[model samples]
Target: GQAPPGPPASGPCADLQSAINAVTGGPIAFGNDGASLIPAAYEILNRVADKLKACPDARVTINGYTDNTGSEGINIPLSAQRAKIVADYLVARGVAGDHIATVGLGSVNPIASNATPEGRAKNRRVEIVVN
Candidate 1:
């Protein structure tokens, strides 16, 4: 019989995820309804950049998510901008621009409930997926 126990716990992409977690105690944050990268977020991205640069062959996907606070028209671009901002930063730091892609999920698949301030804050985040 041949089967994997579970999702492989280690890989280039997983290393990037670990780098992200080690930088900050939580997901890189943003201002509500805006695409600005907070001061702390820059620091976190820097750490991630280091890992990404090391894995030159890695393909990265930066996804922007939003809180349930704006219309689709507003949320979509807002999220897109957020993801693009993160992607741009990584490129500026020397990660290959063509290896990265950005997308805006527009308040979909939230990590927390949108009914409360704190939860909404968590919902508005940028997540990275890699392969």
Candidate 2:
């Protein structure tokens, strides 16, 4: 008697985690308070673009947030800028711009506390929300 196994074929989109992982990565460091897409950050953006192309039906939103260091007036717009920067990069990489949206949540829903420098950095991040 022999047992035959039916293993599933998998690509990046085969699993939800894998799909999320594909585009939900990297921090294109914009220094302490800059919103520039540094060259080093392109790799992740390209990775996201490739994945998005693979799964054409997928829609993504780039949510930009900022640390609690500044007032909402400044933090809000800065967060939006950060989100735009990433979306712009993804678009430049041939990803469908229409499939992407942006939100700037200033000093809200922080991943880490703003009391510490590292935590502040953590708060200053752009999250990828897939739908």
Candidate 3:
């Protein structure tokens, strides 16, 4: 009712979230306390590049973030590492490196609460913003 069931078939970035879902299954996915991409996430990363093939001129920024389960030091670096992980994957797959940008959000700009496990899960995510 709110968010669409998946990315649409066509239009600007219509395939974005769907591609992300096919990869992260959410905003993003990674092993706990680690910035390394999961096995499933790696496959999804590759799949997203295929999706981008339809928009050759599309540029993207991978905003990496983390839940507030710990201090800023831990969260900040983790967020950046996550961003690098995704950026590296995309560039290797032929997405223009110049068209890709990254930001480490640490435990800020959360869409959900930091008080609950479910909310925390949503907070620890990477957002691929296309422009």
Candidate 4:
């Protein structure tokens, strides 16, 4: 008797996460009230593209967030645009656009307090979930 050739493990997604973490040195950051990718962000995103390209069958879910500094209406689109930009970057680098999805969570699911600049900065970030 033997078990199937499958077991719980970190899987290749771990590699993707590791690559992002190593490149960003933390959560991927964006400029306040802007959707443009900072120079360093390109470096990190390029690595993300490379990793996803290596695993063609893999799928990515990008979640964009923002601080509570702005109205939900503005934050919503801003977050969506930011996430879409990251997705576009991956698609441009040859990662199939169909393999990616993006969501703008706005000021919800905050990782830090919105009352402080440092915390708000941390809240404005993009997270990639690989599946």
Q: What's every prediction's RMSD, in angstroms?
A: 8.6, 7.7, 7.4, 7.7
Name model 3 segments beyond 4 Å from true.
1-25, 109-122
Question: What TM-score fits each model?
Answer: 0.78, 0.76, 0.69, 0.77
Task: Order the candidates by TM-score, highest first.
Answer: 1, 4, 2, 3
Clashing residue pairs in candidate 1 are none
What overall lDDT goes with each candidate model?
0.77, 0.72, 0.73, 0.78
Q: What does candidate 2's lDDT look like per residue over 9-41, in tens digits?
A: 554344343565655454444553366655656
Backbone-clash count (model 1): 0
Better of 3 and 4 by TM-score: 4
Q: Backbone clashes per model, in order?
A: 0, 0, 0, 0
**lDDT tens digits, residues 6-114, model 4?**
4434554545656655655765787744667667888888877877766665788888889878999988888888899899988998889898999898888788877
Q: Candidate 1 lDDT, tens digit per residue, 48-122?
A: 887677667677888888887888788888888889999999999888879989888888778887888778888
| lDDT-better candidate, 1 vs 3 | 1
- Let me know the TM-score candidate 4 reaches against the reference structure: 0.77
Query: Candidate 4 regions off by >4 Å?
Result: 1-25
Residue 72, model 3: Cα distance from true site in angstroms: 1.8
Candidate 3, residues 7-54, lDDT tens digits: the string is 446565654655555555566766655557567777777767666654
